[PDB]
């Protein structure tokens, strides 16, 4: 289970280890990293801006 707050926390902390199970979740559930569930409702900021800002 990868919800948006958890994914943002992981990507902001830079924990690359916690992303191993993301691939089976995305493949099995037919979910994509560009889906609305993975975007901030306020701005639409995606995970990559989160990671780049939190350097």
Swiss-Prot record:
It is found in: Cell membrane; Apical cell membrane; Cell junction, Adherens junction; Cell projection, Cilium. Disulfide bonds: none annotated. ATP binds at residues 45, 50, 54. It comes from the Eukaryota. N-glycosylated. Found in the synoviocytes from patients with (RA) and without (CTR) rheumatoid arthritis (at protein level). It is linked to Brachyolmia 3: A form of brachyolmia, a clinically and genetically heterogeneous skeletal dysplasia primarily affecting the spine and characterized by a short trunk, short stature, and platyspondyly. BCYM3 is an autosomal dominant form with severe scoliosis with or without kyphosis, and flattened irregular cervical vertebrae. Spondylometaphyseal dysplasia Kozlowski type: A form of spondylometaphyseal dysplasia, a group of short stature disorders distinguished by abnormalities in the vertebrae and the metaphyses of the tubular bones. It is characterized by postnatal dwarfism, significant scoliosis and mild metaphyseal abnormalities in the pelvis. The vertebrae exhibit platyspondyly and overfaced pedicles. Belongs to the transient receptor (TC 1.A.4) family. TrpV subfamily. TRPV4 sub-subfamily. Non-selective calcium permeant cation channel involved in osmotic sensitivity and mechanosensitivity. Activation by exposure to hypotonicity within the physiological range exhibits an outward rectification. Also activated by heat, low pH, citrate and phorbol esters. Increase of intracellular Ca(2+) potentiates currents. Channel activity seems to be regulated by a calmodulin-dependent mechanism with a negative feedback mechanism. Promotes cell-cell junction formation in skin keratinocytes and plays an important role in the formation and/or maintenance of functional intercellular barriers. The ANK repeat region mediates interaction with Ca(2+)-calmodulin and ATP binding. The ANK repeat region mediates interaction with phosphatidylinositol-4,5-bisphosphate and related phosphatidylinositides. Homotetramer. Self-associates in an isoform-specific manner. Isoform 1 and isoform 5 can oligomerize, but isoform 2, isoform 4 and isoform 6 cannot oligomerize. Interacts with calmodulin. Interacts with Map7 and Src family Tyr protein kinases LYN, SRC, FYN, HCK, LCK and YES. Interacts with CTNNB1. The TRPV4 and CTNNB1 complex can interact with CDH1. Interacts with PACSIN1, PACSIN2 and PACSIN3 (via SH3 domain). Part of a complex containing MLC1, AQP4, HEPACAM and ATP1B1. Interacts with ITPR3. This is Transient receptor potential cation channel subfamily V member 4.
